[PDB]
Amino acid sequence: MAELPPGRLATTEDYFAQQAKQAVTPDVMAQLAYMNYIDFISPFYSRGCSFEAWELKHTPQRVIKYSIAFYAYGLASVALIDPKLRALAGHDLDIAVSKMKCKRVWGDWEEDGFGTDPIEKENIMYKGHLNLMYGLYQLVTGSRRYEAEHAHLTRIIHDEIAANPFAGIVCEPDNYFVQCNSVAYLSLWVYDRLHGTDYRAATRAWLDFIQKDLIDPERGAFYLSYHPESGAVKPWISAYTTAWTLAMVHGMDPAFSERYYPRFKQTFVEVYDEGRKARVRETAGTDDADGGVGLASAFTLLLAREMGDQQLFDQLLNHLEPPAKPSIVSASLRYEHPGSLLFDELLFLAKVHAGFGALLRMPPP
Amino acid sequence: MAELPPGRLATTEDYFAQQAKQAVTPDVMAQLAYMNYIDFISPFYSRGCSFEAWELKHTPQRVIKYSIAFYAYGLASVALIDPKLRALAGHDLDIAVSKMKCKRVWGDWEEDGFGTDPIEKENIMYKGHLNLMYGLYQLVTGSRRYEAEHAHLTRIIHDEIAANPFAGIVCEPDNYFVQCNSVAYLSLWVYDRLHGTDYRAATRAWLDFIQKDLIDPERGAFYLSYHPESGAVKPWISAYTTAWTLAMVHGMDPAFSERYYPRFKQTFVEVYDEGRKARVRETAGTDDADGGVGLASAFTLLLAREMGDQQLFDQLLNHLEPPAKPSIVSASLRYEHPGSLLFDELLFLAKVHAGFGALLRMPPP
């Protein structure tokens, strides 16, 4: 828990103790400096539709929305950890929401031929994250700056769920992903917390729906996707899909995730290096770790954090961080060899994450 | 009350008894036929951005928004009068909202140089009517088709009121009109009825405000406009401004309108033709009726209806209707000599109007 493992910046015990100490660790602070410090090129420099930070990291366009959202989710926990950083966190979330609305972020929807308006129908990965971000911004800050937009988007989501014959909303037309839906549903919980409404009531029918052909309940794993026109499910189970989904669902129905979590571990998690490390296979019938989009281990790090699983957290971060060669130069964090897309975002988020339930319960400013 | 006056289609008693009888008068039915009957050219033929009906009547572009809105207000009362026409009224209100959103309607905002977006700030005449319409549509139908938009617009209005140093919102930049505000405030009352919220709380400060430099208490009349940047109030009192404002306010604070109504009548209303007729002077210091925009008598007809003043309603309609030479041809109403802009719209509305308070209390479908 408390010896510093090789190549690590801080102990697992230290990450887990941040909220009790009311202080982020020095490496988290260095990450926040990376996020905020340098003129023009830091990701949270300004509200403008500029993306230099992402150009410098070679972020693919389609990934930008995810990078901003994951930063935002980590920032909401920063606000909870240290009151003296709450205003900074709020500021950064204001930027995140601003940037999220820039066409460089959502414009794939139009370029791919699916519509000129990214909100009106479908496209739940985008608009689900946006809706969750509106809510987290407001929980952190108390500001109604985006409330009119939040009330609108929450209602578009609710209406589209009510109009669909399946529980939830697609991304591209005819592509249903459980992980993208999980973010949309959690957004309804956040709106409800802020407004006293009951949009979250739709969650029960959703949790029932995803436990049919979308899940292998013995392995504790979701299938890749569902396709409402045919009723097909793509017949491979996905670790990153599962880890993300269980993490968010644990803030809505903790028992659901508690049920599947040990099975999920047995299905996908490989402990290695004499128990010191772990890495995650993306699908069944392979020994290879981190196949597919390459995010199984990083999303499992987030899940371990959400579930309070310090041992697995430690093992995963020992696999992920040391080979990426962190350094802190002028009190700012950089990685020489990030091992995946969304690397600094997901390691940030996992180091700070207070639990989705705790974010829902965030006290007022 | 019950003898039919020369040139009239129905008695004042008949208009006032429609709700008790659960039936519109035959001439009101004929007006609804003008509104709905003929392919392509009737105003309520379809939801499209087509405006042939208004082209045929030579409606000026700037007036379209008012024509649609006044139709909508009348349709809400039709819904209340006759349950068997409630679905038709709901249908027409759906069309009215759809048309109201067409750039032909709101595009003067952009052409005049004020902005490309007619909702985001200012422009309360447009967006106040739109918001009231969204609410009336939902009271009539129970449909949430526009709720996401209604939730957004209501919050833009509320936010703009909170941010302003005067109570309310401008139309064009630096032009404040009490009548346009009255519609926006009533829209909040309707949103509250539907949602259980308290946006209407802002109404008290507004009623306090307008009873300062904007009202002449000796005459029970509002001044034409207020101009926040200079603090100027245009120094002429306006009958049509007053009549419209007192009518809408009577649904929010009936005592306020009751306080001013006898003064307003003494200031502007000329009874003539041995007590049979009445006509309304637009401003002080003149004997001429219906100067300015030419709508004093027609908005006073609405006010008389709202206040339950059968005698004045009868007098005004005796002045307005007979010279316009109504006829009903193939069960549809037409006027050979409409005496003003918005003529059929306002005579429709006054004939059916059940009271703004009664509309707020409309029972569910």
The three-state (H, E, C) secondary structure of B135-182, written as one string: HHHHHHHCCCCCHHHHHHHHHHHHHHHHHCCCCCCCCCCCCECHHHHH
Distance, CA of A316 to CA of A297 (rounded, Å): 7
Contact criterion met (CB below 8 Å) for A301 and A317: yes
Whether the CB of B197 is below 8 Å from some CB of chain A: the reply is no
A-contacting residues of B 262-321, CB under 8 Å? none
| Those residues with Cβ within 8 angstroms of residue A132's Cβ, 6 or more apart along the chain or in another chain | A69, A72, A73, A183, A184, A186, A187, A190
Consecutive H or E run containing B327? strand B326-329
Which has the closest alpha carbon to B177: B120, B105, B248?
B248
A199-229 burial: b if 16+ Cβ within 10 Å, else e: bbebbeebbebbeeebbbeebbbbbbbbeee
- The verdict on a CB contact (< 8 Å) between B148 and A149 is no
Q: Judging by beta carbons within 10 Å of its beta carbon (0-12, 13-18, 19+), is residue B20 exposed, middle or buried?
A: exposed
Contacts for A313-317: CB closer than 8 Å, 24+ residues apart: A313/A12, A313/A15, A313/A16, A313/A350, A314/A1, A314/A5, A314/A12, A315/A271, A315/A275, A315/A276, A315/A277, A315/A278, A316/A277, A316/A278, A316/A279, A316/A280, A317/A8, A317/A12, A317/A347, A317/A350
Between the alpha carbon of residue A143 and those of residues A195, A277, B321, the distances in Å are 13, 43, 53
- The verdict on a CB contact (< 8 Å) between A149 and B152 is yes
- Cα nearest neighbour of A156 on chain B: B148
Q: Which residues of A touch B148 (CB under 8 A)?
A: 151-153, 155-156, 159
Distance, CA of A176 to CA of A166 (rounded, Å): 10
Angle among Cα A104, A108, A112 to the nearest 5 degrees reads 150
B42 φ, ψ to 5°?
-75, 145
In this complex, how many residue pairs, one in chain A and one in chain B, have their CB atoms less than 8 Å apart? 28
Which has the closest alpha carbon to B353: B94, B12, B125, B80?
B80
Q: Is the dihedral of CA B343, B346, B348, B350 positive or negative?
A: negative
Contact criterion met (CB below 8 Å) for A132 and A190: yes
Whether the CB of A143 is below 8 Å from some CB of chain B: the reply is no
Q: Residue B231 gets which letter from DSSP?
A: T
Consecutive H or E run containing B104? helix B103-106
Whether the CB of A101 is below 8 Å from some CB of chain B: the reply is no
Q: Residue B280 gets which letter from DSSP?
A: E
Q: Residue B52 gets which letter from DSSP?
A: H
> Amino acid letter at A44?
F
Q: Work out the angle between the directed axes of helices B239-249 and B178-195 (0-180°, nearest 10).
A: 10
3-state SS of chain A? CCCCCCCCCCCHHHHHHHHHHCCCCHHHHHHHHHHHCCCCCCCCCCCCCCCHHHHHCCCCHHHHHHHHHHHHHHHHHHHHHCHHHHHHHHHHHHHHHHHHCCHHHHCHHHHCCCCCCCCCCCCHHHHHHHHHHHHHHHHHHCCCCCHHHHHHHHHHHHHHHHHCCCCCCCCCCCCECHHHHHHHHHHHHHHHHHHCCCHHHHHHHHHHHHCCCCEECCCCEEECCEECCCCEECCCECHHHHHHHHHHHCCCCHHHHHHHHHHHHHHHEEEECCCCEEEECCCCCCCCCCCCCCCHHHHHHHHHHHHCCHHHHHHHHHHHCHHHCEEEECCEEEECCCCCCCHHHHHHHHHHCCCHHHHHCCCCC
| Those residues with Cβ within 8 angstroms of residue A131's Cβ, 6 or more apart along the chain or in another chain | A150, A153, A154, A157, A184, A187, A191
Whether the CB of B148 is below 8 Å from some CB of chain A: the reply is yes
- Cα nearest neighbour of A147 on chain B: B155
Minimum distance, in Å, between the CA of residue B161 and any CA atom of chain A = 14
Contact criterion met (CB below 8 Å) for B303 and B5: no
> Amino acid letter at A8?
R
Angle among Cα A66, A70, A72 to the nearest 5 degrees reads 115
- The verdict on a CB contact (< 8 Å) between A151 and B155 is yes
Q: Which residues of B touch A134 (CB under 8 A)?
A: none
A231 φ, ψ to 5°?
75, 5
Minimum distance, in Å, between the CA of residue B29 and any CA atom of chain A = 35
Contact criterion met (CB below 8 Å) for A226 and A242: no
Q: What is the dihedral of CA B246, B248, B252, B256, to 10 degrees?
A: 0
Contact criterion met (CB below 8 Å) for B274 and B327: no
Distance, CA of B258 to CA of B357 (rounded, Å): 14
Distance, CA of A52 to CA of A72 (rounded, Å): 18
Query: Is A290 annotated in the active site?
Result: no
Q: Judging by beta carbons within 10 Å of its beta carbon (0-12, 13-18, 19+), is residue B337 exposed, middle or buried?
A: exposed
Tokens representing B44?
Answer: 């309520």
| Those residues with Cβ within 8 angstroms of residue B109's Cβ, 6 or more apart along the chain or in another chain | B115, B118, B123, B126
| Helix (DSSP H) and strand (DSSP E) numbers for chain B | 17, 8
Beta-bridge partners for A332: A329
Contact criterion met (CB below 8 Å) for A217 and A176: no
Distance, CA of B32 to CA of B43 (rounded, Å): 10
Distance, CA of B93 to CA of B91 (rounded, Å): 5
- Cα nearest neighbour of B148 on chain A: A152
Distance, CA of A158 to CA of A278 (rounded, Å): 39
Question: Who among B144, B148, B159 is closest to A152 (CB)?
Answer: B148
Between the alpha carbon of residue B54 and those of residues B60, B62, B78, the distances in Å are 8, 11, 22
Tokens representing B53?
Answer: 């009906």
| Those residues with Cβ within 8 angstroms of residue B359's Cβ, 6 or more apart along the chain or in another chain | B76, B77, B80, B136, B139, B190, B251
- The verdict on a CB contact (< 8 Å) between B152 and A148 is yes
- The verdict on a CB contact (< 8 Å) between B151 and A156 is no
- Coil vs helix vs strand at B209: helix
Distance, CA of B157 to CA of B188 (rounded, Å): 9
Question: Who among B144, B147, B159 is closest to A148 (CB)?
Answer: B159
Distance, CA of A326 to CA of A6 (rounded, Å): 12
Whether the CB of B156 is below 8 Å from some CB of chain A: the reply is yes
Contact criterion met (CB below 8 Å) for A34 and A344: yes
Tokens representing A330?
Answer: 């002028």
Whether the CB of A212 is below 8 Å from some CB of chain B: the reply is no
Contact criterion met (CB below 8 Å) for A353 and A304: no
Minimum distance, in Å, between the CA of residue A246 and any CA atom of chain B = 30
Distance, CA of B307 to CA of B326 (rounded, Å): 26
Q: Judging by beta carbons within 10 Å of its beta carbon (0-12, 13-18, 19+), is residue A197 exposed, middle or buried?
A: middle
- Cα nearest neighbour of A144 on chain B: B159
Q: Which residues of B touch A156 (CB under 8 A)?
A: 148
Q: Is the dihedral of CA B205, B206, B212, B216 positive or negative?
A: negative
Q: Looking at A39, A216, A273, A288, which residue is catalytic?
A: A39
Beta-bridge partners for B272: B277
Distance, CA of A123 to CA of A176 (rounded, Å): 10
Minimum distance, in Å, between the CA of residue A126 and any CA atom of chain B = 18
Within 13 Å and on the Cβ side, how many CA atoms surround B16? 18
Distance, CA of B340 to CA of B298 (rounded, Å): 9
Tokens representing A36?
Answer: 């905020």
A29 φ, ψ to 5°?
-60, -40
Contact criterion met (CB below 8 Å) for A104 and A49: yes
Whether the CB of A197 is below 8 Å from some CB of chain B: the reply is no
Whether the CB of A121 is below 8 Å from some CB of chain B: the reply is no
Question: Who among A144, A149, A155 is closest to B147 (CB)?
Answer: A155
Question: Who among B144, B147, B156 is closest to A148 (CB)?
Answer: B156
- The verdict on a CB contact (< 8 Å) between A148 and B148 is no
Distance, CA of A309 to CA of A209 (rounded, Å): 28
Which has the closest alpha carbon to A183: A145, A135, A219, A226?
A135
> Amino acid letter at A220?
G
Q: Residue B50 gets which letter from DSSP?
A: -
Q: Residue B222 gets which letter from DSSP?
A: E
- The verdict on a CB contact (< 8 Å) between B152 and A156 is no
> Amino acid letter at A310?
Q
Whether the CB of B117 is below 8 Å from some CB of chain A: the reply is no
- The verdict on a CB contact (< 8 Å) between A152 and B152 is yes
Q: What is chain B's Cα-based Rg?
A: 19
Distance, CA of B184 to CA of B252 (rounded, Å): 12
| Those residues with Cβ within 8 angstroms of residue B106's Cβ, 6 or more apart along the chain or in another chain | B65, B100, B118, B123, B126
Q: Which residues of B touch A144 (CB under 8 A)?
A: 155, 159
B102 is in an annotated binding site: no
| Those residues with Cβ within 8 angstroms of residue B280's Cβ, 6 or more apart along the chain or in another chain | B239, B243, B268, B269, B270, B289, B290, B296, B297, B300, B316
Which has the closest alpha carbon to A298: A274, A321, A277?
A321
B-contacting residues of A 158-177, CB under 8 Å? 159
Q: What is the dihedral of CA A103, A106, A110, A112, to 10 degrees?
A: 130
Distance, CA of B289 to chain centre: 20
Contact criterion met (CB below 8 Å) for A146 and A97: yes
- Cα nearest neighbour of B154 on chain A: A148
Question: Who among B148, B149, B159 is closest to A144 (CB)?
Answer: B159
Between the alpha carbon of residue A209 and those of residues A57, A138, A160, B297, the distances in Å are 38, 30, 16, 62
Which has the closest alpha carbon to B72: B53, B50, B45, B91?
B91
